[PDB]
Design a protein around this ligand. Sequence first.
Ligand SMILES: *[C@@H](CC(=O)OCC)[C@H](C[C@H]1CCNC1=O)NC(=O)OC(C)(C)C
Ligand SMILES: *[C@@H](CC(=O)OCC)[C@H](C[C@H]1CCNC1=O)NC(=O)OC(C)(C)C
Lengths: 181, 181
Amino acid sequence: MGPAFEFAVAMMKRNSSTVKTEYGEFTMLGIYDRWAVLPRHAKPGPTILMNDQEVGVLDAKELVDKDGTNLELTLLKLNRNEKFRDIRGFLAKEEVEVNEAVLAINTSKFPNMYIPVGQVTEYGFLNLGGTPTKRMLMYNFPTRAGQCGGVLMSTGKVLGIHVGGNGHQGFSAALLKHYFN
Amino acid sequence: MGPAFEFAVAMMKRNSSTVKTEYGEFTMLGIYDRWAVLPRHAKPGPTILMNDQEVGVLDAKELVDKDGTNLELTLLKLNRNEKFRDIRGFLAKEEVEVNEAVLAINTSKFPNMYIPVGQVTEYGFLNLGGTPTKRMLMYNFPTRAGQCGGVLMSTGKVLGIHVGGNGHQGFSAALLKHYFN
Ligand SMILES: *[C@@H](CC(=O)OCC)[C@H](C[C@H]1CCNC1=O)NC(=O)OC(C)(C)C
Ligand SMILES: *[C@@H](CC(=O)OCC)[C@H](C[C@H]1CCNC1=O)NC(=O)OC(C)(C)C
């Protein structure tokens, strides 16, 4: 997992930030340009705090599969001038599976923390607190609140954004290339 | 840091447990035999919870330097029959310094989480919340409550037990070979 931790730390350091909305505090991954992603339930309003600074949200796309099913991700274009390193070549065309994965969190509650969640298996369909959601990854880990938005990774790969959990299972929304231009 | 994460995960998995006292919930490192260590302020009573199970505390040694100065560590002999893998060869004779270190936490609040704290420099003397304490290591990291007992590590080395913090600095009590037989 060392290589995965090493890739995780460098990714987080480069593309991640702590975001506060009216719905809580989240890890946020900058993707390319001024587009970043949050778990849908961050329900970002018209303005956000990004590393303690009021940032304007130009546009917000709450993603759904072609059948309308919830995928649980919001894309936000950010009213700022600095551009996010482009990490789209780190995102796959389809649900990545893996045996050693790392979940990276970066808030006031979990500042730069990393969790070896181990095995990540495409889970696909899940009733995400009453909401049928697709394209889920699952790992066995006693996840906790405060962790949403967490970035799921292995060496070389950004698998997904952490969205859900119960007890000893967490779930990430798979972060796929085509959601981005 | 990968090698350090890898050593950290394996150490934690082998020698660590979550401990509850009347003073809170702590990470605990089993050293050899049935002796483990906690930060002093865990002030363990006559019985402890160890991974949710009532365990009897045979003996408790709150360590001090020869001049009585606080070192901030309690050693506890545990009323159980299973023996802790002996990790004393992982503990140094003196305050280890390093450039890439990892702090491993393992409670209900931070279950199996790892933090790359980076540079660890012998700090020695610190006024640890009104208590002059010696043999401290320091790292720059925005540490948070719930983290005490955390195990501080690099590849091949167990440096210390996390005891203190303010804002962007945490402090570990150096975990030295001779505290143990
Ligand atoms: C992640 C959201 C969160 O952590 O709140 C602020 C960052 C929640 C899932 C955690 C609960 C148990 N395991 C977890 O990782 N999800 C959440 O609060 O919302 C729904 C949509 C109900 C999952
Ligand atoms: C560590 C103890 C703790 O986390 O409580 C339950 C596990 C506290 C130090 C944290 C505060 C800011 N940074 C930290 O890591 N220390 C503590 O509570 O006690 C004294 C002795 C005052 C440090």
